[PDB]
Design a protein that fits this description.
The structure is cut from a larger assembly and holds chains A (about 600 residues) and B (about 475 residues). Chain A is an alpha+beta fold. Chain A folds into four domains: about 70 residues, no CATH class; about 300 residues, no CATH class; about 70 residues, no CATH class; about 160 residues, no CATH class. Helices cover about 35% and strands about 20% of the residues of chain A. Chain A contains 17 helices and 24 strands. In chain A, the strands form six sheets. Chain A has a six-stranded antiparallel beta barrel. Chain A has a six-stranded parallel beta sheet with strand order 8-20-19-21-24-18, with helices on both faces. In chain A, strands 12-11-9-14 form a four-stranded antiparallel beta sheet, with no helix packed on it. In chain A, strand 3 and strand 4 form a beta hairpin. In chain A, helix 8 runs parallel beside helix 9 and helix 12 crosses helix 13. The radius of gyration of chain A is 28 Å and the shape is elongated. The termini of chain A are far apart. In chain B, strands 1-7-4-5-6-3-2 form a seven-stranded antiparallel beta sheet, with no helix packed on it. In chain B, strands 11, 13, 14, 15, 16 and 17 form a six-stranded mixed beta sheet that branches. The radius of gyration of chain B is 25 Å and the shape is elongated. The chains are: A alpha+beta (about 600), B alpha+beta (about 475). It is classed as membrane protein. Keywords: V-ATPase, membrane protein.
Amino acid sequence: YGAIYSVSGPVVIAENMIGCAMYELVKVGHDNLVGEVIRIDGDKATIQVYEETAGLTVGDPVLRTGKPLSVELGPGLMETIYDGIQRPLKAIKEESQSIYIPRGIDTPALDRTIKWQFTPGKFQVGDHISGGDIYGSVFENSLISSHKILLPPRSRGTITWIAPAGEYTLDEKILEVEFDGKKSDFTLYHTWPVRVPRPVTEKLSADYPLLTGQRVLDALFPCVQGGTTCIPGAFGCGKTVISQSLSKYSNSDAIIYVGCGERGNEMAEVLMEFPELYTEMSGTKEPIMKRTTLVANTSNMPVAAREASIYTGITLAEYFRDQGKNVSMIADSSSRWAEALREISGRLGEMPADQGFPAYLGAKLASFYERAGKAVALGSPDRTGSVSIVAAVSPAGGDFSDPVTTATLGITQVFWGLDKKLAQRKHFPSINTSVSYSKYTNVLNKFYDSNYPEFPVLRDRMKEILSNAEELEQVVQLVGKSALSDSDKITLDVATLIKEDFLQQNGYSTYDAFCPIWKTFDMMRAFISYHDEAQKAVANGANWSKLADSTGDVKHAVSSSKFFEPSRGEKEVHGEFEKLLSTMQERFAESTD
Amino acid sequence: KKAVEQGFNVKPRLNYNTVSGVNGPLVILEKVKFPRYNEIVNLTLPDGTVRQGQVLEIRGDRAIVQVFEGTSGIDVKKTTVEFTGESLRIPVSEDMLGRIFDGSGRPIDNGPKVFAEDYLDINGSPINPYARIYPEEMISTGVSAIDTMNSIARGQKIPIFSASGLPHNEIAAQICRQAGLVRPTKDVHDGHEENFSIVFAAMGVNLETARFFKQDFEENGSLERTSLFLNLANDPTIERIITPRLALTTAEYLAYQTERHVLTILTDMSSYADALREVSAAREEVPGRRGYPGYMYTDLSTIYERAGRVEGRNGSITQIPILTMPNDDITHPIPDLTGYITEGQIFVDRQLHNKGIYPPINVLPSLSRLMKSAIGEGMTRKDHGDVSNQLYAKYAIGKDAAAMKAVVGEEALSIEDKLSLEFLEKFEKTFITQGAYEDRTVFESLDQAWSLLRIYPKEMLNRISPKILDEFYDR
């Protein structure tokens, strides 16, 4: 079709190129470099090539594709590792044995050769169908038992031919529907313009907690599945525990890890960890890689790939939401994606408007985070899903003032706020409870009052005593410890116990690797009851030191309460916690005398 | 079999006498037959001088050739520009180790052209992120301040941030002379089983320093492992952009197509950024932040991220991209971006250099993010990590207590702080302070570190684990 008329760095101006919509991916050159039409004028379109244009020549054919940047959704997408624009980074290494990514490589985003078992749904021939209707389930892998395929949201009509149960590759023309007499065939996979969200019937209000498994996160600073999240992605803060606990323990039925322009060795570390992370439930031996896809990008990936990394991640997440799976992205270092946006804007000449970032950085971030939210999938049957974006921010110099981090803090409801100092003291998970706010605490009352009624007031009490101790450490610095009242000393001792044995979670031992919500609630009750009994028996009784020395066994019991095995059973653990509380009450009654 | 027989075909080169316009470092052709975008040309001057140029932009039948070595003398009538058919590509071979190359790939020494094994393209290709593997073992640099407690792992890409006039440009020579695996130091087996090499790359070095590099690598034994890519300050700036790509392509060859490791050095990447500004403004692009092009980060990453170990291939490229602090501020775009792409930073500090220390490494801000991989029982001694931690802690104590000596007087300092002043003096003057030509094996440097930490009683060494103290403190 059209021929190249001009090349200047990455931009490439085609000619006689009538019929190419804006933002339409066009294969450039004889090597089929992938570029997107960034500007069309008359019959010539300024193509913005992704790969290096070191070899392009005037007259090289540029062939349209008729699709904007589109991820390739379907089975076989569960386990693989992708770059920014969904090039499978394993198939590229396997078919082109070289360590490098060849220019203009075009391995299909989903494995064509694998034969998927397919069982058709309730939709018979002649049944009217709509976008998003589940017309069959495919056994992808043992951890995604039914990858329910579904008609593309922008297709509708009468089913004219449905494939019977059998093993099919992704090119097998599974279903053929008719609309306005124009037959259209559908395969096991469908593509979707990445920059427009997959539609939903109704986008509900996310009100079910995303149990990360970390005690401090689920207790004090909760995030709701379907809700967003922000994380300081600076080195050494302890981002590893957050990412691995989200992808390893949380109730999310899928994970879309997306790394934008992360340092090459960081992505090497992530791609070597994730294959060797295992899930204790849903079987015993299934690795999490059986349910998570990684959109990996070293910093030298083409700038457009880094700029579209979070978009492809969110479109894969929306796909796994439309099947009813509470998928949860973990977007690592969104600040690198903002850097990619800055480069695209500057190279395009778009005028910078805030510290060099383009004008639409705020709008793009707001939209991308708005693609979160528990939502009712399109079509029928009407299963609901939810996408959660836990997106880390790692500003240029740790400034935490550049517009990307300000926008993310403004938009993301919960900001778990890791800290370097808490990590140097080896206080994992290194959550800085002073700043780590969470605006999902309110919408979660509908869940708490259902089955953990005392949780909200309990965490309010724990947070207020923790803040009181943080304030009173300044008073201890100013004047000697003895100047504190008995109640103040109680607060300091109880909050030290908190910081040492409730927030501080080993995470590596078998007893507290996964702190379930019921165990966290029972520990919260134990700790708050300890503070309350000490406070009461001192306000109406003897000096704090005498009780503390007299009831040191009770404090040891509540401290060792962290060791109760979650595998012991919810009923057994709750009964044990009730036994601990009863022995507590009787021991404080005894020492009150 | 070797499929390199395709090189026997001869491709005649067109020779255009149609240089219609000349503008700055550019010349503009017309009536060109399919001008490839990036394409080296042998632009001939009226007198007969050959002056290489690189095609910078094409439009229909017009190619804006950018000319190296200035533009003066290029007329519109007599000059004839000849298109070589392919972009610039270095001729590589396993036996360039020992050749001091010019900025543009031509050997600048008295040796002949390299009997090329291959003609590797310059820009190469990005390394498959799935094909990377994590840095594992130490790559000893002989510098006590860097080897022990700013350690570098095979595959790490850690810079040496440096002030304008600091001797960083001599620390580069010291590292390139003394770099090497710790396997020969281990002495438990053949350490030369897997060879080591270096590909130095000086960019923007003034001749008084390029000659110093050439002399100091020839005179010492480091040349038979080094591919010194020198380009001068007054050498064409486009060659200054080319040189880091040249060195990284050579490093990728030596480290992946052969198997030997390599510790590539990129001297003064600030000058490379300066040259990249000239390229950006040549294309009439508007300046981004600070005058550097907005895509500064992209063309820095496409250099740094060409390093790291690889699954399958045994080799590994270790970068130490040295760069000069423009005005001694991290906030400058170049140090900021490099620290945003690299795995840490190793400061060279003006304050220590004014005291006469060498090297003037400032340990307190310098850190290696993935140092903990290159430290342990297998590589270096088992006490290396805790020795590093304790040295850093006691150095911080010494610095703040040296600050307080002028505030609360010397006699009012706790005995910990008095011992910390003594330790800081001995530290800065014997451990950090290293002779310019003194190669300190990492085991030997750890021995000095222990001879320095045994100032303190075993109880005051809280940072070190007791199981290590109980066997290393006394010896």
